Structures are given as structure tokens and as C-alpha cells.
Amino acid sequence: QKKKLVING
Amino acid sequence: KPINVRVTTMDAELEFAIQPNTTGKQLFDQVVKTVGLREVWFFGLQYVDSKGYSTWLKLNKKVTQQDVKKENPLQFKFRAKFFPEDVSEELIQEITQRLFFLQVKEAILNDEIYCPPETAVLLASYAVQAKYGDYNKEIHKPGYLANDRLLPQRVLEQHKLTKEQWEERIQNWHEEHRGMLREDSMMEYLKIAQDLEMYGVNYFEIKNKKGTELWLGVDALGLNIYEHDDKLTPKIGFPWSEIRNISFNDKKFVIKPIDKKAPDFVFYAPRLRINKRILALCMGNHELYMRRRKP
């Protein structure tokens, strides 16, 4: 599977 | 047609019956309502699936739609999934302090969290004060701790003292805590335990691009990479503030640093189930991290 998680920016 | 379920906290056994379309959140809410827990953001429900794998219950999905081991009643463990950056400023309720105290003490006693012998004695000291209250020479006569498990096995094995001798050291500290309230004793235990290197860290076996075996640590403050034979001191740290984003592709795990110079960091997990678990702990931990700031 593909999953992303934004923490900052 | 009701569905019977049993939920066990560190010191209680709860019996509920849910409907077919009950969500994890609804079950969860019934649990915290029953024990009067208001500091709910740290907790979750653990269950075992048909394949015998421990899993956290998804609160947004129906209970019946999560492959919980078939049985009557269904079995769940209510436990803290997340840890406060500091117990002092986050755990106000006695129920909450008690649940963390018991869960952490269990992990320390099972050698889950490494603890120096000296610290194990001090920790045991607060647990005794919490359990027995003030030391009373008239009632707490020598041997009063003979039936209590107070130190982790590792500590007992590295130092060949007899149980009587360990108890003697524990008692001396116990006497010094007179006047300390049960709840305050539990918090002192936690203040000490929370400074242990392995406290509040979720470790996962991983490998880097060179196939080297390492451990991925996920905690309240971000992620850390540990060498396979040393889970105390990080090889490298990835505080939330240094992390741009985090993503995973099946077994691949990537950490894009905010920094311009620093390149990305790739790590490989054995199973997709592991990466999903990691991402979930990363999401939950970061979320609570930000609530401590803005929300």
C-alpha cells in the first residue's frame, strides 16, 4: 500500500 | 442480535453487549464512561484477530468488520497507546494516573523497559508506598514484602542479593515516603519511569538500504533509529520539527527531512502490517504533539 503523512512544511 | 464483549483494563473487567453495527468509537466511549476516564486521548482497545495477531481496534470502523477473533464474548484490552511528554502536566485524574502507573509498572517488571537496579529499588519504593501507604513499624514488620513482586528479573539476576536484602533496601526508601498520598506515590513512580530511555517507545525491527538490521523507534517526540544491539541510545534522531513528511510504499518507509542538504532516509519493514502500524503510531503521536501546542 501507499500512504503519506505530512508533518511540517 | 446483541454481541457480547469483555474489556479488561489494568485492574478491571468490564462486560458489555453491543449491536451488530457498533463502531469501535462507540465501544470505546462506553468503556471510558464506565470507568469515568476523561483523559481518553492516550488510550485504545487491543484485540486479537483470527490469525492470532494483536491489533489496535479502529474506532471509525464497525467492530464486527475488523476480524476480531471469533468467540463469545469478544475479548478486548483497554490500554494506553500513547504516552504524555510529561505525566505531571498531562495526567490529572486518579483513574488515568492509576492506569498508566499499572501499565508502566507491569512493563518495567517484565523487563520490557530497561531499568538500572538502583532505579528499580526507588521505583519499587513508590509502588509499596502506593499499595501499603505509610510505613508502620507495628504493622509493616520484616517480611511484609515477601509476597510482592517488586523488581524486574534482570535486576535480581545481575545482583545476587537475597529477597530479604532487596526488601531491606526497598523498605528504607518506603519509610522516607511517609505522608505521601497513594495517587502522589503513583505519579512519583511515573516521573522516574518517564525518564527511562525505553519508556514510551514503540520499537520495530527494520533494515536500512545496506540490509543492516536496526530498530525503528516511534515515540511522543518523533522517530529514532537504533542499532540492532542497542535500544537505549538512538543512532539517529528525527524530531517532528525536522520531518517534512513520512510515507511508506508497501515495505518501504521514507522520511523526507525539511532540510535542503540532508537527503531522504529509506528503511524497510518485514511486512506491510508493520508499516501500517508504524504510520498509525506516527500519526497519533504527532497529532497529540500538536495538540500540546495549538489545539
Side-chain angles (χ1 to χ4, degrees):
Chain A
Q1 251 297 298
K2 175 282 292 64
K3 302 292 181 180
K4 182 175 180 180
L5 180 71
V6 184
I7 304 305
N8 274 325
Chain B
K1 179 59 184 182
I3 309 171
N4 303 295
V5 302
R6 179 155 81 224
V7 176
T8 56
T9 67
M10 285 311 300
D11 64 5
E13 183 182 301
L14 307 184
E15 297 293 309
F16 307 87
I18 60 171
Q19 293 74 188
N21 42 48
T22 309
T23 58
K25 184 65 165 58
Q26 287 171 149
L27 173 54
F28 183 83
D29 296 328
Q30 184 70 304
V31 175
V32 302
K33 181 181 183 182
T34 302
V35 303
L37 173 67
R38 299 169 67 75
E39 287 159 339
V40 311
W41 40 88
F42 301 114
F43 309 78
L45 292 168
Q46 294 174 169
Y47 71 98
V48 184
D49 67 1
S50 67
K51 288 168 282 62
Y53 295 121
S54 286
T55 317
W56 285 102
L57 189 78
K58 301 303 294 69
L59 304 199
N60 61 174
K61 303 305 177 188
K62 284 181 289 188
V63 181
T64 176
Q65 312 305 315
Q66 299 184 53
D67 188 46
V68 175
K69 176 176 178 181
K70 295 293 179 180
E71 67 182 309
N72 171 54
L74 297 306
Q75 300 301 326
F76 298 94
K77 281 180 178 166
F78 181 81
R79 296 289 189 287
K81 184 173 182 175
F82 304 107
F83 297 76
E85 284 180 43
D86 187 329
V87 292
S88 287
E89 52 193 60
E90 287 176 77
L91 311 182
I92 309 302
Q93 295 185 290
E94 183 287 327
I95 178 59
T96 318
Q97 310 180 324
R98 199 205 313 153
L99 293 183
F100 272 89
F101 168 71
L102 292 177
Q103 192 180 311
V104 171
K105 176 160 85 68
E106 165 179 273
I108 282 173
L109 261 25
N110 290 316
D111 302 290
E112 308 283 357
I113 299 173
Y114 172 66
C115 178
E118 167 171 37
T119 308
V121 174
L122 181 51
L123 280 178
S125 192
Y126 287 112
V128 309
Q129 180 57 40
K131 173 173 179 177
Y132 294 89
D134 280 0
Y135 169 74
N136 175 198
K137 176 54 189 175
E138 294 181 62
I139 186 174
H140 305 307
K141 298 180 181 179
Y144 74 105
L145 299 180
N147 304 299
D148 290 296
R149 182 173 75 161
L150 305 165
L151 305 167
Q153 270 303 311
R154 175 182 51 62
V155 165
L156 298 180
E157 296 178 356
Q158 79 180 74
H159 289 290
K160 304 106 59 184
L161 290 62
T162 64
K163 192 181 196 306
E164 299 81 293
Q165 282 163 156
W166 281 119
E167 291 171 18
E168 183 185 308
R169 288 165 179 272
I170 294 172
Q171 177 186 306
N172 290 173
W173 270 119
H174 181 191
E175 297 180 16
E176 304 189 20
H177 300 146
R178 79 158 315 184
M180 190 175 291
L181 287 296
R182 172 197 184 70
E183 304 76 16
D184 288 356
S185 302
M186 289 187 269
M187 283 300 278
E188 284 310 305
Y189 184 97
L190 291 170
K191 286 163 62 179
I192 289 172
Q194 80 183 342
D195 286 323
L196 291 175
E197 301 94 329
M198 307 182 75
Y199 173 93
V201 181
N202 302 278
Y203 298 88
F204 303 93
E205 296 195 73
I206 55 162
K207 296 178 180 297
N208 60 195
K209 289 188 297 190
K210 312 311 170 186
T212 309
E213 267 191 285
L214 306 158
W215 291 95
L216 192 210
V218 180
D219 66 34
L221 305 177
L223 318 187
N224 291 294
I225 297 296
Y226 302 79
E227 292 179 301
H228 199 63
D229 58 313
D230 174 38
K231 303 167 80 170
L232 285 59
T233 305
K235 187 186 68 171
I236 169 174
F238 292 96
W240 301 128
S241 56
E242 300 182 356
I243 298 179
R244 185 192 308 161
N245 73 65
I246 295 174
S247 66
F248 72 75
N249 172 60
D250 177 41
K251 76 177 187 297
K252 290 178 51 53
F253 204 62
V254 188
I255 308 182
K256 276 69 173 62
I258 299 181
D259 195 303
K260 179 178 182 177
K261 281 186 172 62
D264 303 321
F265 288 69
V266 199
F267 302 89
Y268 306 76
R271 283 61 174 57
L272 181 58
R273 290 193 52 160
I274 297 299
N275 270 322
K276 293 180 301 174
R277 289 209 68 283
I278 292 167
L279 203 293
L281 281 172
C282 284
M283 191 183 300
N285 271 287
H286 189 57
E287 193 190 311
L288 296 182
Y289 183 75
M290 295 188 296
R291 277 183 45 186
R292 306 195 177 99
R293 276 75 185 181
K294 190 281 291 300

